[PDB]
Design a protein around this nucleic acid. Structure first.
Lengths: 48, 33, 48, 37, 97, 141
RNA sequence: AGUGGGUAAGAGC
């Protein structure tokens, strides 16, 4: 079942843990994705 | 044997060859000579 | 950031309290289950 | 002197009872769960 | 006289402690007149286990030693070896150390 | 407690010790109403039948039978004595008092091990047996 | 700071 589910992408990327990242790498990737959002650390116009 | 009284003038400490012990001096009454 | 390539954010890490509790519980059950157990087994469990 | 006397007024009962039991003719001398059952 | 009573009480306490020491006819624990208890010889390990006294006994021994020190300071002052100032200093040193 | 046999006078205790030629006699010295004695009683009753082959259990109330209190130092709330062929057997439990088990043991497996080790050591003619489990530390953590 | 948790058992003289 897992071989099939990886053959045809039944599980979208957000499903974790994947066979590519250890959980600490998952945390690092989450932090990096949060940081890499376009103008995520903006508070001049009150966005949160 | 259960249900039988002790013989008169018998020391249960004796009659068996038993010997006591003294782990310390704080326990037990003072030995009398 | 993947565009500015600058230090936009700072990430401070910490070990979760649940993880510390789990580790303490593991060490406690290693120790308390050592009445009849070789020293090498205890040291290997602690090392692991 | 007074500090040690005030220690003595409280330490006296312990030694008194201990020696009274010790010098007496006859010497005298994990339970939470296994209490009710 | 108070010094007489102190000497009498020191002697009586020594006698009581000696009676307690020789409780099971174990006569190898020598207690001196300054309330220092020591084995008379190299006692065997069986004897050393058999000659264990609780914390209460040693507390009593040391408190009687303290009273012995006080009464001995008074006796030394009465004899004339130490002045009244020296007696007071000795008593203060006893009660501080 | 009440299930196990009870000895009422010191002569009965002597007869019980003498009459056993090939079984270790385990005697609980204490008071039936003592909670620690209650733990010893319940453990012994739990394993009174498992070790019937090579042991026997007797209960003695030191208030009604004080005849050993001086000689056996029967002043702890509960003590356990092991005898083999009219000879008291010592156990190097690790607590510094090899003469008796003066504390309550929760595990019945530990007491079965103690009885079996006592039987093995005393059958070989030895008078002191080394306990299978150390008891200088309660292993609480 | 501190006591311990350090008793080999056995044979009769």
């Amino acid at each position: 079942l897992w071989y099939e589910a990886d053959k045809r992408r039944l599980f979208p990327p957000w499903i974790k843990p994947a066979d590519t990242e250890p959980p600490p790498l998952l945390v690092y990737k989450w932090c990096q994705g949060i940081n890499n959002l376009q103008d995520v650390w903006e508070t001049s116009e009150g966005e949160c | 044997f259960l249900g039988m009284p002790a013989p008169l003038g018998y020391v249960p400490g004796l009659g068996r060859g038993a010997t006591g012990f003294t782990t310390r001096s704080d326990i037990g009454p003072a030995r009398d000579a | 950031n993947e565009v500015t390539k600058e230090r936009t954010a700072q990430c401070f890490l910490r070990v979760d309290d649940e993880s510390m509790q789990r580790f303490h519980n593991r060490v406690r059950q290693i120790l308390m289950a050592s009445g009849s157990t070789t020293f090498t087994k205890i040291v290997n469990k602690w090392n692991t | 002197w007074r500090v040690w006397l005030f220690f003595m007024r409280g330490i006296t009962p312990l030694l008194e009872r201990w020696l009274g039991n010790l010098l007496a003719r006859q010497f005298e001398g994990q339970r939470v769960e296994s209490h009710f059952d | 006289d108070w010094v007489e009573v102190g000497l009498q009480v020191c002697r009586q306490g020594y006698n009581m402690l000696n009676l307690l020491i020789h409780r099971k006819n174990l006569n190898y624990l020598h207690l001196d007149y300054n309330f220092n208890l020591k084995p008379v010889k190299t006692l065997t390990t069986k004897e050393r286990k058999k000659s264990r006294f609780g914390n209460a006994f040693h507390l009593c021994r040391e408190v009687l030693r303290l009273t012995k020190l006080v009464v001995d300071s008074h006796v030394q002052y009465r004899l004339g070896n130490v002045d009244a100032f020296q007696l007071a200093d000795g008593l203060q040193y006893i009660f501080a150390h | 407690s009440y299930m196990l046999p009870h000895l009422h006078n010191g002569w009965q205790v002597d007869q019980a010790i003498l009459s056993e030629e090939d079984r270790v006699v385990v005697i609980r010295f204490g008071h039936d109403w003592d909670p620690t004695c209650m733990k010893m009683d319940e453990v012994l009753y739990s394993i009174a039948e498992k070790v019937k082959n090579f042991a026997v259990i007797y209960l003695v109330d030191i208030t009604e039978v004080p005849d050993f209190n001086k000689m056996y130092e029967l002043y702890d709330p509960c003590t356990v004595m092991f005898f083999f062929r009219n000879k008291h057997i010592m156990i190097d439990l690790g607590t510094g008092n090899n003469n008796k088990i003066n504390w309550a043991m929760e595990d019945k497996q530990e007491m079965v091990d103690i009885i079996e080790t006592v039987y093995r050591g005393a059958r070989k003619g030895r008078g002191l047996v080394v306990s299978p489990k150390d008891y200088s530390t309660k292993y609480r953590y």
